[PDB]
Amino acid sequence: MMSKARVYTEVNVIRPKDYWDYESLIVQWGEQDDYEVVRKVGRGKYSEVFEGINVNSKEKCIIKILKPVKKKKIRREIKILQNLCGGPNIVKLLDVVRDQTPSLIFEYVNSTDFKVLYPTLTDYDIRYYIYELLKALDFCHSQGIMHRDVKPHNVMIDHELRKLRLIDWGLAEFYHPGKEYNVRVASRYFKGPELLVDLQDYDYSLDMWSLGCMFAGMIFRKEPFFYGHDNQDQLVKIAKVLGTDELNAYLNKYQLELDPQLEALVGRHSRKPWSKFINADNQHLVSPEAIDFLDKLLRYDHQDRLTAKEAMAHAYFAQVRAAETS
């Protein structure tokens, strides 16, 4: 029996085919002359990022110049950005222009890099920003979409405005129950066990593992938390913490077999309690509720992880939920 999402299972079934059939998307291009590059903001594997301006309004934007890319892949990101445009803490696609090739125009966000920000984040900042990120995840999941590349680099945080935006939807996909996906998604350190053991019928829960990796890195001040030197080593790094008994049960449940070369690397390991990662430098960020929350994200079995909605309801976010009401 194929694995299926515990939540939002049927969202794309009841949608018109036009909603998820991104491959048939007719892109309505603007014109490049409407937007102008000001300063380079960053480099990427698929694109170059620039801080730019709308010439016909002096309005500042982010310009993402997509490098070489297939027609199918460009339409997937554009269609998904359009489908999600307006949701909480989702980056907003303003326009799509081209010379060929393309170029995506987004709203501007004055982001601070996580390598500078996270070491200064307080216990409350972490609870606050993770909660904001969960808003984004619950929304895109409820719209039948998995992000599949959750990581600090794709979470833009304006620390003075205390805004958060989930960006780079280039690896996102539509969730269709029963579908086998590519496991070569996400970024190494944030890859869920499903991608490392070749479980292809995964779902939204993949994003919750990635979140857990981010979360562990923040509260334990350990970046990245799971530091594998390749995809096989990535599993080993996880097994040395979660332990191999839980790994074996998970493989058994989904009738998975590790190839012998990977099996030799994984070996045998006892579970390392989350408390073993507490030290003098990070102790102010760790509490019984933070550990319980993290422990419910970082499970081998994707079905056993908290959903975005369940995560928002966790006691770790009690103060943030109450402080938000007003």
Q: Which residues are catalytic?
A: 149
CATH superfamily of 17-108: Phosphorylase Kinase; domain 1 (3.30.200.20)
Domain ranges in the chain?
A: 1-16+109-326, 17-108
Taking the C-alpha atoms of residue 11 and residue 156, their distance in angstroms, rounded to an integer, is 28
Cβ burial, residue 24 (10 Å; 0-12/13-18/19+): exposed
Cβ neighbours of 70 (radius 10 Å): 8
Q: Determined by which method?
A: X-ray
3-state secondary structure of 252: helix
Which residues belong to the annotated binding site?
Answer: 41-49, 64
Which residues belong to the annotated binding site for ATP?
Answer: 41-49, 64
The CATH number, out of the four listed (3.30.2420.10, 3.60.21.10, 1.10.510.10, 2.40.50.140), of the domain defined by the range 1-16+109-326? 1.10.510.10
Taking the C-alpha atoms of residue 295 and residue 299, their distance in angstroms, rounded to an integer, is 7
The DSSP H or E segment spanning 41 is strand 35-43
DSSP secondary structure letter of residue 188: G
Look-up: residue for tokens 């998820």?
20
DSSP letters spanning 264-292:
HHH-------GGGG--TTTGGG--HHHHH
3-state secondary structure of 15: coil
**How many H helices and E strands in the chain?**
12, 9
The one-letter amino acid code at 10 reads E
Under 8 Å between Cβ of 211 and 133: yes
